[PDB]
């Protein structure tokens, strides 16, 4: 159909970087842009168009059941394939991400009004704290 | 007026790059920052101020009529001047962006609840898919 | 507690950079990513989890009283420490940021429905305009 009216949210983006490089867009702009998603609003009246495009941060969703392994594609980071398995150790939620990187996984737990997250890959550990809203 | 209360949205930004260089901000941080807009919330009571600043992604508008050539400044990408012409090929919306780059243009079409966009410059082709919201 | 339900806003992040490096995340992405905060939404029923994580731009806050010098940590830009003093010159709000950078400060004023901001560091001046929302 020719009727392009609506709000449209990006779901896939292939070779955005090669296209941007052809436009001589700088190295830093290319790498940051290729991770963003976009929203296009198209306002169309016959053959007349008013278009609006805006970058947005991608939402990165993951669903799982404790004790049931699942395939995870780490699009929020390095976009690798891992086989992820989440277990309870007491009240600590523990995830092992089996794949190319050794000793990769995370631990997540609630203490008080705070969520604690420890991210591990190899010999590097990232430690994060979140406040409840 | 001394009364600065309100929410303020950026509409122009001159020499942000030179100011950031003087502050010795790294090339990469500068290229991400220079393209964003800002919102300032000012909460003022007499001479007491609570100020809030937040970066936001810029919205890029383009208006055209099918079959009517128009001057396009590709602000969302490489900020070049092109002579753009949009035509229908059946239900495919086709754009030729005549200018410094050879074989530059795009194709856009609706199939089902999805919008398809193909961006071309020279021998580089980027393919994007959007879902209706 | 095992009950991780809620919306969680990041408040601290330690060695995110080392973790991203271990994942082979590119230099540019690492530099822009460290400046972001994130919100995690957790929808949990027993051992079933639906998790959503989204990056967002940080809010940068400043509180001050006209005529009272204060310590300012310029996190939104170069992350320097300055001694800031804000004064009125007529209806123009004037700030001197005393510190490592010479001739550093800003001037801010309302004219009509617009906020004007002049940012100065050394011999570089950035000029910004905001419209009221």
Swiss-Prot record, chains A, B, C:
Question: Where is it found, in Gene Ontology cellular component terms?
Answer: cytosol; nucleus
Record-listed all-trans-retinol binding positions: 40, 108
Q: Which family does it belong to?
A: Belongs to the calycin superfamily. Fatty-acid binding protein (FABP) family.
Q: Where in the cell is it found?
A: Cytoplasm
Q: What is the protein named?
A: Retinol-binding protein 2
| Molecular function via GO | fatty acid binding; molecular carrier activity; retinal binding; retinoid binding; retinol binding
Which organism is the protein's source? Homo sapiens
One biological-process term from Gene Ontology? Answer: fatty acid transport
Q: Which UniProt keywords apply?
A: Cytoplasm, Retinol-binding, Transport, Vitamin A
Highest taxon of source:
Eukaryota
| Alphabetical list of CDD domains matching this protein | CRBP2
Regarding tissue, the record states: Higher expression in adult small intestine and to a much lesser extent in fetal kidney.
Q: Could you confirm whether the keyword Cytoplasm appears in this record?
A: yes
Pfam annotation, one family? Lipocalin
Comment field on protein domains: Forms a beta-barrel structure that accommodates hydrophobic ligands in its interior.
UniProt-listed InterPro entries? Calycin, Fatty_acid-bd, ILBP, Lipocln_cytosolic_FA-bd_dom
Indicate whether Cytoplasm appears among the record's keywords: yes
**Where primarily located?**
cytoplasm
What is this protein's gene name? RBP2
Biological role: Intracellular transport of retinol.
């Amino acid at each position: 159909t020719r009727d392009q009216n609506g709000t449209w949210e990006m779901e896939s983006n292939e070779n955005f970087e090669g296209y941007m490089k052809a436009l001589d867009i700088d190295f830093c702009t290319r790498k940051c842009a290729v991770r963003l998603t976009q929203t296009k609003v198209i306002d169309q009246d016959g053959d007349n168009f008013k278009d609006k495009t805006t970058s947005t941060f991608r939402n990165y969703d993951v669903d799982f059941t404790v004790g049931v392994e699942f395939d995870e594609y780490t699009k929020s980071l390095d976009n690798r394939h891992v086989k992820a398995l989440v277990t309870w150790e007491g009240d600590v939620l523990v995830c092992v991400q089996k794949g190319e990187k050794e000793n990769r996984g995370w631990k997540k737990w609630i203490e008080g009004d705070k969520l604690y997250l420890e991210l591990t890959c190899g010999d590097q550990v990232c430690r994060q704290v979140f406040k409840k809203k």
